[PDB]
Amino acid sequence: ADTIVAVELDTYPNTDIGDPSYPHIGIDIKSVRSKKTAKWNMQNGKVGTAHIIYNSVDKRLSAVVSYPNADSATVSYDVDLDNVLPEWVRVGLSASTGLYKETNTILSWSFTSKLKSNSTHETNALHFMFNQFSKDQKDLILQGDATTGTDGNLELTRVSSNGSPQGSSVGRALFYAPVHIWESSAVVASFEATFTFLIKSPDSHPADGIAFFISNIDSSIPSGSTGRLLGLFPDAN
C-alpha cells in the first residue's frame, strides 16, 4: 500500500484512537497511532519551529518543537528506515482540520539528505530551503486545499479571504524531486528537516495539526483522511 513515516504535531487529543489526553508531538510509523509521543505546550497564534533529524548509524529519528521562550518538546524513536521505507521517496508537509479548525501555515522549510558511500566525503546530497513561497511554486507538488503566495507563506489547509481558518480541510505539500533516502552500499545515510509554522485558532478548540512525512514517490491524500487522520492515513488502525 502507501508507506508513511511522519512526525506529527497533533493539536487535538483523540483519546479514543490512542492520542494522549493533551496536544502532543509523535513519531508515526505506518499508523496514526504514534509509536512514541511527548507532551507539547501548544501556543495559539505563535510562530514555532520543528527540527527532525535521522542518521543511519544511530538508527534513531528525533524531533524538537519549540517557540521563542518556551521549553522544547522532544520525541525520539529507534527505527531503522532501511526496512520500512523504499530506497526512493518524496518528503512533504501535511495538515488537516475536521470538526474543529485552525490555520496550518508554514512560514519556511528546509531539508538536506546525504549518502556517504564507499570512500571519502564524496556523497549524493540534496538540499532545499524555502524562506518564502511563490504564488506559482513549481517545485512543490500541492495536494488538497494547500496553496502558496499568501504573503509568501504556504497554507496547508483552507483559510478565508478575510483571514480565518476553515474546518474539514486537507492539504499536503510534497517536494518535487524524489529523494534517495537510503541505499545498500552507503556508509552513512542522514537527513534533517526544519520548518516554521503558525497554528492559530478562532475558537478555543484548535484541531488537528501539522505533519512532516516521508512517503513513497506516488503517494496521494488517502480517501477520507480529514480531521484526526492528518491527511496521511486511510483509517485509524
CB under 5 to 8 A by kind: which of Ca ion, its own copies, Zn ion, none does 131 bind?
its own copies
Cell numbers standing for residue 106:
508554514
Tell me how far, at minimum, the Cβ of 69 lies from Zn ion, in Å: 25
The distance of closest approach from Cβ of residue 91 to its own copies in the complex, given in angstroms and rounded to an integer, is: 12
Partner in contact with 82, chosen from its own copies, Zn ion, Ca ion, none, beta carbon below 5 to 8 Å by kind: Zn ion
Using CB under 8 A, which of the segments 29-37, 55-63, 66-74, 121-129 binds its own copies?
Answer: 121-129
Among residues 34 and 113, whose Cβ is nearest to Zn ion?
A: 34
Q: Which of 4, 9, 10, 186 binds Ca ion (CB under 5 A)?
A: 10
Q: Quick check: 32 and 14 in contact, CB under 8 A?
A: no
Number of residues that bind Zn ion (CB under 5 A): 6
Which one, 13 or 152, has the nearer CB to Ca ion?
Answer: 13
Please state the separation of Cα 2 from the chain's center in Å.
16
Residues 203-222 that bind Ca ion (CB under 5 A): 208
Cβ-proximal residues to 76 (8 Å cutoff; 6+ apart), any chain: 27, 36, 60, 61, 62, 63
Q: Quick check: 14 binds Ca ion (CB under 5 A)?
A: yes
Round to whole Å and give the CA distance between 149 and 132: 8
Q: At closest approach, how far in Å is the CB of 5 from Ca ion?
A: 17
Check residue 132 and report its DSSP letter. S
Work out how close the CB of 19 gets to Ca ion at its nearest, in angstroms, rounded to a whole number: 5
* Residue 12 binds to Ca ion (criterion: CB under 5 A): yes
Q: Interaction with Zn ion in 67-86: which residues (CB under 5 A)?
A: 80, 82
CA 207 to chain centre: 15
Residue 226 CB coordination number (10 Å): 20
> 3-state DSSP call for residue 211?
strand
The nearest distance, CB 82 to Zn ion, in angstroms, is 3
Q: In the structure grid, which three cell numbers stand for residue 92, read together?
A: 512533504
202 binds its own copies (CB under 8 A): no
What 20-26 contacts at long range (C-beta under 8 Å, 24+ apart), as own/partner pairs, is 23/206, 24/73, 25/50, 25/63, 25/65, 25/73, 25/75, 26/75
- Give the phi and the psi of residue 216 in degrees, each rounded to 5: -70, 155
Q: How far apart are CA 186 and CA 123, in angstroms?
A: 9
14 labelled binding-site residue: yes
Using CB under 8 A, list all residues that contact its own copies. Answer: 87-88, 108, 117-118, 122-132, 134, 136, 138-139, 175-180, 183, 217
